[PDB]
Short mmCIF file of N, CA and C and ligand atoms in Angstrom, two decimals:
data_model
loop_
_atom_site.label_atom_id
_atom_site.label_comp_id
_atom_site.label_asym_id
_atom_site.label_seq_id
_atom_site.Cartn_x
_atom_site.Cartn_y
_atom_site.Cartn_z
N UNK A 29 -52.25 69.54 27.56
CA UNK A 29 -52.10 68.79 28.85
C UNK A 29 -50.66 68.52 29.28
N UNK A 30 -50.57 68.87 30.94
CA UNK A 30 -48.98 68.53 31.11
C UNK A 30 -48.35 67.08 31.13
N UNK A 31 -47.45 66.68 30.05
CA UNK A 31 -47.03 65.15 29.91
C UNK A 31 -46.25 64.62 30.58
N UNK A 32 -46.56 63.77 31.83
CA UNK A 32 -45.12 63.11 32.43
C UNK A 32 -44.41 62.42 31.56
N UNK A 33 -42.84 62.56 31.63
CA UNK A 33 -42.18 61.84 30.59
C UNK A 33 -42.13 60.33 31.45
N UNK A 34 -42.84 60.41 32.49
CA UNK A 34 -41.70 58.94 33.15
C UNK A 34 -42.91 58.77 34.39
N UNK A 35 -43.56 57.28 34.53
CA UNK A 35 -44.51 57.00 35.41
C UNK A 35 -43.84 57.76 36.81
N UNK A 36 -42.64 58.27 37.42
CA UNK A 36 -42.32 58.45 38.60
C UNK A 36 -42.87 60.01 38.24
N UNK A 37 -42.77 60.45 37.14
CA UNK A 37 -43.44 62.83 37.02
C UNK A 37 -45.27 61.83 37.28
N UNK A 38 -45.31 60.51 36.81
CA UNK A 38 -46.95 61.07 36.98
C UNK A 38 -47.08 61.01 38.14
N UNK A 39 -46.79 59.79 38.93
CA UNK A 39 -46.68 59.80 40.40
C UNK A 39 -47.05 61.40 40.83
N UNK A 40 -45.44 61.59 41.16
CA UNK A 40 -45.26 63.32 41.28
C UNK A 40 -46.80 64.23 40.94
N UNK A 41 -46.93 64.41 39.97
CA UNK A 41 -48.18 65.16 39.89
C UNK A 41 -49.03 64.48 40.13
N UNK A 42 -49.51 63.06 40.54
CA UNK A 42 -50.96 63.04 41.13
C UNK A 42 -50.58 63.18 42.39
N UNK A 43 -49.66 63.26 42.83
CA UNK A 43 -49.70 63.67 44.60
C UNK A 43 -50.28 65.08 44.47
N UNK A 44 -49.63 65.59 43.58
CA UNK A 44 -50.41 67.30 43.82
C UNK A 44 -52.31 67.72 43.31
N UNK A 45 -52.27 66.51 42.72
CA UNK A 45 -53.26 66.71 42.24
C UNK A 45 -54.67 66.10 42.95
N UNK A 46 -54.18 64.95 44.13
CA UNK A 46 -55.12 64.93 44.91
C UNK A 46 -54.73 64.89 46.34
N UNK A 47 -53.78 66.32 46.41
CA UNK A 47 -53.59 67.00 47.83
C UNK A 47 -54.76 67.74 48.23
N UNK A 48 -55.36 68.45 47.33
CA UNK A 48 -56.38 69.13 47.74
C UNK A 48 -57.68 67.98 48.41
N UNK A 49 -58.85 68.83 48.27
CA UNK A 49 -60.20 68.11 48.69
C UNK A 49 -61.13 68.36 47.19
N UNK A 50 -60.67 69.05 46.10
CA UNK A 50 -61.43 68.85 45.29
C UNK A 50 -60.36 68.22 44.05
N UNK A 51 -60.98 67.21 43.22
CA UNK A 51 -60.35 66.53 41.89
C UNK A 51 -60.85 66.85 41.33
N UNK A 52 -60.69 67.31 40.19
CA UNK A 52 -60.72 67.46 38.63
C UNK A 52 -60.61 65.83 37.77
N UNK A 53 -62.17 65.49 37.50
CA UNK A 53 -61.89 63.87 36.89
C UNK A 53 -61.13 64.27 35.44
N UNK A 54 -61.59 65.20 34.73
CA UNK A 54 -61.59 65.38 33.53
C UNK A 54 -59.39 65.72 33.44
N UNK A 55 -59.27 66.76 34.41
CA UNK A 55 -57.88 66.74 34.20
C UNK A 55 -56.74 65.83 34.87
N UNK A 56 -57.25 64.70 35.55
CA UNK A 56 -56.87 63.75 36.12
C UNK A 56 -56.59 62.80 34.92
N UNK A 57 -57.56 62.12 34.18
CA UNK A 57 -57.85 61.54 33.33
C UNK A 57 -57.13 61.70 31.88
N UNK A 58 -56.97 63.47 31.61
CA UNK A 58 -55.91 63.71 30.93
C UNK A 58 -54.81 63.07 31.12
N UNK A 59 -54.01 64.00 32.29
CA UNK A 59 -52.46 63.66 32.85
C UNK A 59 -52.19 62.13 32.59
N UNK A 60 -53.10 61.52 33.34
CA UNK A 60 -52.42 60.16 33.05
C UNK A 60 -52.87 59.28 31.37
N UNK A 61 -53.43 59.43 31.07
CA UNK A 61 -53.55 58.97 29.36
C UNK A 61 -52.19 60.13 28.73
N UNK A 62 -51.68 61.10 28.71
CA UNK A 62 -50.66 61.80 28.58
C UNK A 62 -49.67 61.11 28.59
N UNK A 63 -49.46 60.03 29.73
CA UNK A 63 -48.27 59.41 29.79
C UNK A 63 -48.45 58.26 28.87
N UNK A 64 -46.92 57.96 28.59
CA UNK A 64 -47.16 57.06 27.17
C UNK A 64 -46.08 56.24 28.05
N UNK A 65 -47.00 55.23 28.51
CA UNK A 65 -46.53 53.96 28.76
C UNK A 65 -44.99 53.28 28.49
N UNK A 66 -44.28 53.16 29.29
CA UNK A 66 -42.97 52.33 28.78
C UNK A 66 -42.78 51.37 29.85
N UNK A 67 -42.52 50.10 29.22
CA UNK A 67 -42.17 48.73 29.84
C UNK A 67 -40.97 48.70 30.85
N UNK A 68 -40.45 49.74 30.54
CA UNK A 68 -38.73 49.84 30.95
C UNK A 68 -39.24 50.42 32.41
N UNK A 69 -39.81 51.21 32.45
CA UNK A 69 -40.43 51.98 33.82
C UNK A 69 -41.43 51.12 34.44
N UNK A 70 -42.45 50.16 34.12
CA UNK A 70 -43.24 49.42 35.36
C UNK A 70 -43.23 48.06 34.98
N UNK A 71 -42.16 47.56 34.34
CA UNK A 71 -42.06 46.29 34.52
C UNK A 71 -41.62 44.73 35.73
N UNK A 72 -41.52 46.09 36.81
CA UNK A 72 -41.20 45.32 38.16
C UNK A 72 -42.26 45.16 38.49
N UNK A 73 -43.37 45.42 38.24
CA UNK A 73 -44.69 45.22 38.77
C UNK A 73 -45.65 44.15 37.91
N UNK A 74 -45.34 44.06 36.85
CA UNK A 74 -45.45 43.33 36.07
C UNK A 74 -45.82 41.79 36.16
N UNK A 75 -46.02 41.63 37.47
CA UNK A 75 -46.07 40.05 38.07
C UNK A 75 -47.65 39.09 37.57
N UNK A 76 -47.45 38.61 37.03
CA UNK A 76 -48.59 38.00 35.96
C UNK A 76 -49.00 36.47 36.88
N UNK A 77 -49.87 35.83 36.32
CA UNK A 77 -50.50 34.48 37.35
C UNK A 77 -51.28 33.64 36.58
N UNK A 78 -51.08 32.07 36.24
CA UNK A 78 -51.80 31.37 35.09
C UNK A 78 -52.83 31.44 34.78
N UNK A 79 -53.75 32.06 36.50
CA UNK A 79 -55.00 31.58 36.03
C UNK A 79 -56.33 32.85 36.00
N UNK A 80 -55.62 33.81 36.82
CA UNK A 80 -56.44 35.49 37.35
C UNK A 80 -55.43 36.12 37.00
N UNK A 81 -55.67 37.25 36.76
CA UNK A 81 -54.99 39.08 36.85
C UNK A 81 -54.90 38.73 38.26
N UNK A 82 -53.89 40.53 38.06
CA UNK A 82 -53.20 40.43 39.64
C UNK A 82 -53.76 41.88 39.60
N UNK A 83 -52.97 42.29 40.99
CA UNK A 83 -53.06 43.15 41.49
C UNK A 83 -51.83 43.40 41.83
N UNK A 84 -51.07 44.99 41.37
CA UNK A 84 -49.38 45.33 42.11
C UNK A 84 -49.65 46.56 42.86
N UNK A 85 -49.77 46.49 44.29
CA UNK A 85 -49.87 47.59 44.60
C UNK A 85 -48.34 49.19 44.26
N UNK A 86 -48.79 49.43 43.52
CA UNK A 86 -47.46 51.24 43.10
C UNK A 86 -47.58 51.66 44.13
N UNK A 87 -48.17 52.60 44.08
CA UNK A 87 -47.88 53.96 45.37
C UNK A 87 -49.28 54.16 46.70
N UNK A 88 -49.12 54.35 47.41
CA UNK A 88 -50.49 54.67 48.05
C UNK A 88 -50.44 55.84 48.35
N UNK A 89 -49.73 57.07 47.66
CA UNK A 89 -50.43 58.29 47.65
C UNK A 89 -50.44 58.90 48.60
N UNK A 90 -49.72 59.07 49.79
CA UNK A 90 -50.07 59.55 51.04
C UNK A 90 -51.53 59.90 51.55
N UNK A 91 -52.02 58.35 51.18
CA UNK A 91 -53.04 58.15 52.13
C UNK A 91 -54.65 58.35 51.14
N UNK A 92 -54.33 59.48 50.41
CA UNK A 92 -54.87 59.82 49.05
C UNK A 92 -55.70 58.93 48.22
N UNK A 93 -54.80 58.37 47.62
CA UNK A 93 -55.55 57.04 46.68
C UNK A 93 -54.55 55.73 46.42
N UNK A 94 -54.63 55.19 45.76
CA UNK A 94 -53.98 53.82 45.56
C UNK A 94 -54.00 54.06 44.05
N UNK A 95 -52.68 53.48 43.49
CA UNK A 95 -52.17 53.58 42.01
C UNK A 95 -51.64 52.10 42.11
N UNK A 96 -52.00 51.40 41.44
CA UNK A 96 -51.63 50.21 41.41
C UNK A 96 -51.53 49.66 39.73
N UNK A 97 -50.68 48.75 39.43
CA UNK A 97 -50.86 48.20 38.58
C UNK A 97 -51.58 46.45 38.35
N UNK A 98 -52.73 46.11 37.16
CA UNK A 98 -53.41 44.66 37.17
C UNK A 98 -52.98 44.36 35.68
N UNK A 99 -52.38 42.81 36.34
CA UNK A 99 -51.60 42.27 34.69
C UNK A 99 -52.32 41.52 34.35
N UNK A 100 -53.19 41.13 33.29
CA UNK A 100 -54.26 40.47 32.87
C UNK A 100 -53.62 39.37 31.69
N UNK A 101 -53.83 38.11 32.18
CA UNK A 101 -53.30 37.00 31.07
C UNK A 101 -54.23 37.18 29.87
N UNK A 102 -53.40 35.85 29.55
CA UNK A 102 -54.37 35.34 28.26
C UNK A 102 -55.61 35.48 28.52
N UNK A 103 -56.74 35.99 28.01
CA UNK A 103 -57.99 35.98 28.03
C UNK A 103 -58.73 36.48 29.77
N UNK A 104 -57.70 36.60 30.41
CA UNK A 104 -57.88 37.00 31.79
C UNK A 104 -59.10 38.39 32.04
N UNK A 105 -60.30 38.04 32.88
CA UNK A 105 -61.38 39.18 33.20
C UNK A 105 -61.65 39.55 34.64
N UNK A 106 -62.24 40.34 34.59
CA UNK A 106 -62.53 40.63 36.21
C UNK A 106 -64.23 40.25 35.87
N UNK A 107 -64.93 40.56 37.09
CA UNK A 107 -66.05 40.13 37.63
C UNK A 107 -67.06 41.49 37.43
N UNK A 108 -68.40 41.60 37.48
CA UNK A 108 -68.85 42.96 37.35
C UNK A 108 -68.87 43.10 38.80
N UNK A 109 -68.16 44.69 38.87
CA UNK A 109 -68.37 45.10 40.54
C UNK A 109 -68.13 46.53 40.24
N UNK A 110 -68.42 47.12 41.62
CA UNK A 110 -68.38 48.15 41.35
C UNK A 110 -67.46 49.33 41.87
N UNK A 111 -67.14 50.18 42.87
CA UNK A 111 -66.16 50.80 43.13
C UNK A 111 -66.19 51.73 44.61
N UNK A 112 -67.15 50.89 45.35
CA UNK A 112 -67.26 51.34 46.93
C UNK A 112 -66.90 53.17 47.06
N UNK A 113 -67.68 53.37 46.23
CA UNK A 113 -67.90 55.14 46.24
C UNK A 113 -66.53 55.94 45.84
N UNK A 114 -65.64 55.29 45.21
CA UNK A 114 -64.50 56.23 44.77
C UNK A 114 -64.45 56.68 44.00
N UNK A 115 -63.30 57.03 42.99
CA UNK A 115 -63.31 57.41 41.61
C UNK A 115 -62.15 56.38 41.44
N UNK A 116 -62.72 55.66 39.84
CA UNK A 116 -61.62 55.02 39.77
C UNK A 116 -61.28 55.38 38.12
N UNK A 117 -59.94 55.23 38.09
CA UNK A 117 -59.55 55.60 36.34
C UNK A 117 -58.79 54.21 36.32
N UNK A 118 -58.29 54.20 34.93
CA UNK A 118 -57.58 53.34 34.66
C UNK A 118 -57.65 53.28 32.93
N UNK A 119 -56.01 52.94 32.88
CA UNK A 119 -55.29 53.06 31.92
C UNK A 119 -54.45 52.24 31.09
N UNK A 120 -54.37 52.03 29.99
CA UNK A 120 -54.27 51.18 29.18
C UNK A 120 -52.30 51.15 29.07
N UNK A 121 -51.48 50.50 29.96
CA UNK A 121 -50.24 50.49 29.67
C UNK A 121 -49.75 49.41 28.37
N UNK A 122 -50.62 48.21 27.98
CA UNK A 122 -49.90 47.11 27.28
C UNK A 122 -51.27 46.43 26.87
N UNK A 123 -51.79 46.37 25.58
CA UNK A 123 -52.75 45.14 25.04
C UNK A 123 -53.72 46.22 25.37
N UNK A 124 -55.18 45.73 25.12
CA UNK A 124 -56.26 45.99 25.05
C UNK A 124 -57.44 45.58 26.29
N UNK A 125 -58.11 46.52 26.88
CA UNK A 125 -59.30 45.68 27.65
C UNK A 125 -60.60 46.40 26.99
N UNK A 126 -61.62 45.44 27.21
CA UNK A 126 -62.71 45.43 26.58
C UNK A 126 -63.76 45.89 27.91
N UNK A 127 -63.97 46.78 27.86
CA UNK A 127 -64.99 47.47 29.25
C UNK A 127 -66.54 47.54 28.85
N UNK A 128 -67.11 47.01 29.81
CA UNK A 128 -68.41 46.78 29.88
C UNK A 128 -69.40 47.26 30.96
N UNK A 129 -70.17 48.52 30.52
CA UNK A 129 -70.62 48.81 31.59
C UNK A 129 -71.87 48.52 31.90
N UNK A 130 -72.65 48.27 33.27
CA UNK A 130 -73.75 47.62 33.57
C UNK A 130 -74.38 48.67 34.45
N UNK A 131 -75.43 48.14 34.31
CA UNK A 131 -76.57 49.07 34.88
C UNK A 131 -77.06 48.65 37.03
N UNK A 132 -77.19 49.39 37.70
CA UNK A 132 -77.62 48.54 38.94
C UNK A 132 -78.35 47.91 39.27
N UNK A 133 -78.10 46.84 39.91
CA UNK A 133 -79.64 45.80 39.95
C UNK A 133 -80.75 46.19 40.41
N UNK A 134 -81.98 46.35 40.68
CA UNK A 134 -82.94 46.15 41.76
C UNK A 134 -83.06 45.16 42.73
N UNK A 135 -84.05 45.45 43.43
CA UNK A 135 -84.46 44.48 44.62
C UNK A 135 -84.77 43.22 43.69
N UNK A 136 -85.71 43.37 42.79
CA UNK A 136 -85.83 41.84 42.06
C UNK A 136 -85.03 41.69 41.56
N UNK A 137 -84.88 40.28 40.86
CA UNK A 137 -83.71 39.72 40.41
C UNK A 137 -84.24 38.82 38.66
N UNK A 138 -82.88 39.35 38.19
CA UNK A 138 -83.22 39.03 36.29
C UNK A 138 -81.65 39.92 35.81
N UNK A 139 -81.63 39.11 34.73
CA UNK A 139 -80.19 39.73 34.36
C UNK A 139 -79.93 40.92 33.83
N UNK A 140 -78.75 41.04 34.07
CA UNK A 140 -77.92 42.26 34.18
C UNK A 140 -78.27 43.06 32.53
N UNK A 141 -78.42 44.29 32.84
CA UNK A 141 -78.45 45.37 31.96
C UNK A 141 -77.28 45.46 31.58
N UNK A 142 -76.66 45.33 29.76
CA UNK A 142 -75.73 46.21 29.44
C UNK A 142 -75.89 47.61 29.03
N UNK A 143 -75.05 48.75 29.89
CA UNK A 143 -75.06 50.07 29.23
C UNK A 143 -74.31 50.65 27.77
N UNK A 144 -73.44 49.89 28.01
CA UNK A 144 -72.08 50.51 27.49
C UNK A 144 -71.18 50.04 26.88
N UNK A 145 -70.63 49.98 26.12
CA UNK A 145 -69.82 48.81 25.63
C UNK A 145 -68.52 48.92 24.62
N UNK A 146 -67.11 49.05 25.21
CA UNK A 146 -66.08 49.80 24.62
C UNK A 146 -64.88 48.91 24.59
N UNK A 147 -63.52 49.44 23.64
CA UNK A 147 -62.56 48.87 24.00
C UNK A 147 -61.35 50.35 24.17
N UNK A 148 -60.71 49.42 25.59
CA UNK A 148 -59.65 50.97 25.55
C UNK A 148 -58.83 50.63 24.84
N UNK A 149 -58.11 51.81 23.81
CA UNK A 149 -57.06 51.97 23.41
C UNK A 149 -55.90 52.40 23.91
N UNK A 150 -54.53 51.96 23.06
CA UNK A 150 -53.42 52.67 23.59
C UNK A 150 -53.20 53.31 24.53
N UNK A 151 -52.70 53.67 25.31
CA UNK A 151 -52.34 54.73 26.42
C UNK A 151 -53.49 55.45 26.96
N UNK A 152 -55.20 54.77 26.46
CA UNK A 152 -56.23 55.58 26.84
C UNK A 152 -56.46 55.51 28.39
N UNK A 153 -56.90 56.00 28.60
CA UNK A 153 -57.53 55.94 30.25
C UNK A 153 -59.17 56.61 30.27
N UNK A 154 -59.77 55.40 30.92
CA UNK A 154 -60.85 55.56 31.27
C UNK A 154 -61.10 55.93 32.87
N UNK A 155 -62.56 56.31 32.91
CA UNK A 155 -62.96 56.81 34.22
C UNK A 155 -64.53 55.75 34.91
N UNK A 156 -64.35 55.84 35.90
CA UNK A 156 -65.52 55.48 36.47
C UNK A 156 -66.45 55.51 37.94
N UNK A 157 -67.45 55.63 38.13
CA UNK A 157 -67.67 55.65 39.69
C UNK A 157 -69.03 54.86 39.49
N UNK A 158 -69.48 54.86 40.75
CA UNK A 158 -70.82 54.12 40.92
C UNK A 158 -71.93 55.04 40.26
N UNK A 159 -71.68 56.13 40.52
CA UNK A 159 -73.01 56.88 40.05
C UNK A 159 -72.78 56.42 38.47
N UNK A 160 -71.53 56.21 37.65
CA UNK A 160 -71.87 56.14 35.92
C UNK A 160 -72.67 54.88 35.89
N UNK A 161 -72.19 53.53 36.96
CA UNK A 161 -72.45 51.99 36.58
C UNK A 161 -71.68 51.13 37.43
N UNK A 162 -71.94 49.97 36.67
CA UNK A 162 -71.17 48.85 37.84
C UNK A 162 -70.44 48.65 36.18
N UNK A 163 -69.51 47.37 35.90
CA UNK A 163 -68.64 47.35 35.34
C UNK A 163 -67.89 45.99 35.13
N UNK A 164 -67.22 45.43 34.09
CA UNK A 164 -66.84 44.49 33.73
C UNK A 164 -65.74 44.93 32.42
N UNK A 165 -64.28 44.54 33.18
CA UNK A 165 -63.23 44.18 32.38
C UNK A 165 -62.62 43.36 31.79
N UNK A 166 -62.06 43.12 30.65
CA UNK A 166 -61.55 41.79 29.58
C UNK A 166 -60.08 42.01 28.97
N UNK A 167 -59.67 41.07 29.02
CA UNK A 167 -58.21 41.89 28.10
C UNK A 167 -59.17 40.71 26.75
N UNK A 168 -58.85 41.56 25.64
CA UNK A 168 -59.63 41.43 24.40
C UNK A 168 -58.99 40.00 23.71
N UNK A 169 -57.39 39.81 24.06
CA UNK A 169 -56.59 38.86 23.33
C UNK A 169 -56.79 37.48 24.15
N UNK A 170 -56.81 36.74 23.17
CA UNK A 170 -56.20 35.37 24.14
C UNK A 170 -54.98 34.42 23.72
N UNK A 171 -54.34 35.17 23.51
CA UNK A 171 -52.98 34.62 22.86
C UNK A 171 -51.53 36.03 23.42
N UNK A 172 -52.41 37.71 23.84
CA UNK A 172 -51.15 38.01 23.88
C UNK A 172 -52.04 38.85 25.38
N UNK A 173 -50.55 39.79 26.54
CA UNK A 173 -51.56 40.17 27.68
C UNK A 173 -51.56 41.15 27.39
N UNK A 174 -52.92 41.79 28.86
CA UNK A 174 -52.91 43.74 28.70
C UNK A 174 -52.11 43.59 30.34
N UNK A 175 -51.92 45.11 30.42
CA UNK A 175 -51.66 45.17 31.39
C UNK A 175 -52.18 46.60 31.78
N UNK A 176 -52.80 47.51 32.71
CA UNK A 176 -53.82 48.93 32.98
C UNK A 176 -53.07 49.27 34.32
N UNK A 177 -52.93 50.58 34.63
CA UNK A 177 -52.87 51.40 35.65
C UNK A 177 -54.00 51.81 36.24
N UNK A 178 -53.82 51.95 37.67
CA UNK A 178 -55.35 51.79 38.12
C UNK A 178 -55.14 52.76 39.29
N UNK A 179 -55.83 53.88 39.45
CA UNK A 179 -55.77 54.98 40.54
C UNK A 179 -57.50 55.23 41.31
N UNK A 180 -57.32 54.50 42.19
CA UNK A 180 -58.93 55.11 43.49
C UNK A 180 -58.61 56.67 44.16
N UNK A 181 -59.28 56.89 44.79
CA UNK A 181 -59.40 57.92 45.56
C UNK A 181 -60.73 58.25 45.98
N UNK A 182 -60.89 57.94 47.42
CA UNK A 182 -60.27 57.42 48.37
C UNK A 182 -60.09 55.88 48.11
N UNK A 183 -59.01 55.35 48.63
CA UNK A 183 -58.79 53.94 48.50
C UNK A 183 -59.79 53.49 49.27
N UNK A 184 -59.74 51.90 48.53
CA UNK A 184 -60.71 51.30 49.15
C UNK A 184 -60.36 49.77 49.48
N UNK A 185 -60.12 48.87 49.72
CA UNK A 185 -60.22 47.51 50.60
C UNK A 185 -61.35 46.60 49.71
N UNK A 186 -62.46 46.64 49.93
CA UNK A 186 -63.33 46.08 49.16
C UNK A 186 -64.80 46.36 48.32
N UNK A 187 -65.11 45.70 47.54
CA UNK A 187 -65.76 45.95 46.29
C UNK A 187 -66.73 45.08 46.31
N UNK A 188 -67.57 44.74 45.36
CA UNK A 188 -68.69 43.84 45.46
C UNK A 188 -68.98 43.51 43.84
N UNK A 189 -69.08 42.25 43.87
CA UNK A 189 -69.23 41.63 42.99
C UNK A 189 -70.72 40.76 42.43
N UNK A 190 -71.24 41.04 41.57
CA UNK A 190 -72.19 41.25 40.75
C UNK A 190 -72.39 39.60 39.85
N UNK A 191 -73.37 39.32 39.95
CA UNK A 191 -73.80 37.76 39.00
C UNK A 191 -74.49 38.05 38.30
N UNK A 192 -74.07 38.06 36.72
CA UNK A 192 -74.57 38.84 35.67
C UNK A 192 -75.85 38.01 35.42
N UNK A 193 -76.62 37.09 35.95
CA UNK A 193 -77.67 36.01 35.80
C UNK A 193 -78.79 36.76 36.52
N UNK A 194 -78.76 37.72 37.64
CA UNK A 194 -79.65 37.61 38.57
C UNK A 194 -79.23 38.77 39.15
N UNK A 195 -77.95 39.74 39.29
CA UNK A 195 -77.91 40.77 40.11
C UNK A 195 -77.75 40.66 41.35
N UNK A 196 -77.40 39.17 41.70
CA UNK A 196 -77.34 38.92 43.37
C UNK A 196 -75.67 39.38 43.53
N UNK A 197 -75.22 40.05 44.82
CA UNK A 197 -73.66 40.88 44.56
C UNK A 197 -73.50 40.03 46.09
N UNK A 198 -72.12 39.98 46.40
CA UNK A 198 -71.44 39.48 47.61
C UNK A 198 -70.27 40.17 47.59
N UNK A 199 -70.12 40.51 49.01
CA UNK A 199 -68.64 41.35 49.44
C UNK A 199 -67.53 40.71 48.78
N UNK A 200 -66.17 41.26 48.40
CA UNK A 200 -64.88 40.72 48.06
C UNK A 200 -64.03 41.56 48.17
N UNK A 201 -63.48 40.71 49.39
CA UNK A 201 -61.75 41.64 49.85
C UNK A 201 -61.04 41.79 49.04
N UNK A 202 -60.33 42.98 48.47
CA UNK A 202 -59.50 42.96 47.59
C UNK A 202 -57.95 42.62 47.98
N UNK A 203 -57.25 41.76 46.80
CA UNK A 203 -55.81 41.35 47.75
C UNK A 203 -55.19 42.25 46.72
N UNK A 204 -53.80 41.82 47.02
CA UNK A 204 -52.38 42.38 46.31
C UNK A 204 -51.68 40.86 46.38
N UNK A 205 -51.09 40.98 44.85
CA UNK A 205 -50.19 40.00 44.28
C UNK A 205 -49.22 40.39 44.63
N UNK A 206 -48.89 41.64 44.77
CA UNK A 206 -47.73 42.01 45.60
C UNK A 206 -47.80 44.15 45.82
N UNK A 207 -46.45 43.71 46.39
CA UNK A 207 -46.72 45.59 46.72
C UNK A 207 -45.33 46.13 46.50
N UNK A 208 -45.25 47.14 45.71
CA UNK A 208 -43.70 47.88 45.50
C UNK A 208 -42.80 47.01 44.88
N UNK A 209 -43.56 45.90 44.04
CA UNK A 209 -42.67 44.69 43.42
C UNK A 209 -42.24 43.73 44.15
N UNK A 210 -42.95 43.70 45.45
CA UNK A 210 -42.33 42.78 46.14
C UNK A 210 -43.88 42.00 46.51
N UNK A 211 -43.26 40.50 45.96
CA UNK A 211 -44.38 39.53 45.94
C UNK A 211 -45.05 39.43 47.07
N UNK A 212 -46.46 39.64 47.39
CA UNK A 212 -46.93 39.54 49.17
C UNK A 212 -47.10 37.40 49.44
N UNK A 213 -47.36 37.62 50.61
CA UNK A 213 -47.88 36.42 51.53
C UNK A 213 -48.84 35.35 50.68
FE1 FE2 B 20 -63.52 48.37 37.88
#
């Protein structure tokens, strides 16, 4: 697999790689687990928050997808939701997350199906879309953070979020903690 030495070659090659109209998940998924993470290169994005993960918007890809980086505190999780028809990967730059995948609700209501149940490693990168599941992230520590690279295509705005009690989901705008390292509004 070709290795970017430096998050700006992966950049670089995912522009080429989702110029076309068809992606390759499998060699997408490579390339970026290929890259071996260094602090020195996305630590401007790095913007952390006492009480939620963030969101840093990186690059938007010419239009393509969204590469963003989410800095996850102490014990910091996301919600089960799912991924408004994209492809989403994401990659393990710092610490550990604990991924949980769930099954879709029905019309009735009773709790959530677990499918799946993993922790990413090192520099791993995982994949996902709606057709695999809906989904739930953890950074595993609660004493040290993770921090994951996160690439959609097509970008998306908002997601829906899942009540692991009952399967009842409600819209949620997605924000940015900031964009290009620069803290938003
Ligand atoms: Fe997700």
């Amino acid at each position: 697999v070709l290795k970017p030495r430096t998050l700006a070659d992966l950049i670089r090659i995912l522009h080429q790689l989702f110029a076309g109209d068809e992606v390759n998940v499998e060699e997408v998924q490579a390339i970026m687990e290929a890259y071996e993470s260094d602090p020195t290169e996305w630590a401007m994005y790095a913007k952390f928050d006492q009480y939620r993960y963030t969101r840093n918007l990186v690059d938007q890809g010419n239009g393509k997808f969204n590469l963003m980086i989410l800095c996850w505190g102490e014990g910091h999780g996301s919600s089960i939701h799912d991924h408004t028809n994209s492809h989403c990967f994401l990659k393990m730059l710092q610490g550990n997350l604990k991924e949980t995948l769930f099954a879709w609700p029905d019309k009735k209501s009773n709790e959530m199906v677990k499918k799946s149940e993993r922790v990413l490693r090192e520099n791993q990168c995982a994949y996902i879309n709606d057709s695999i599941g809906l989904h739930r992230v953890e950074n595993i520590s609660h004493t040290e953070p993770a921090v994951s690279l996160h690439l959609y295509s097509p970008p998306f705005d908002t997601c829906h979020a899942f009540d692991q009690r009952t399967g009842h989901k409600n819209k949620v705008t997605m924000t940015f903690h900031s964009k290009f390292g620069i803290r938003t509004p």
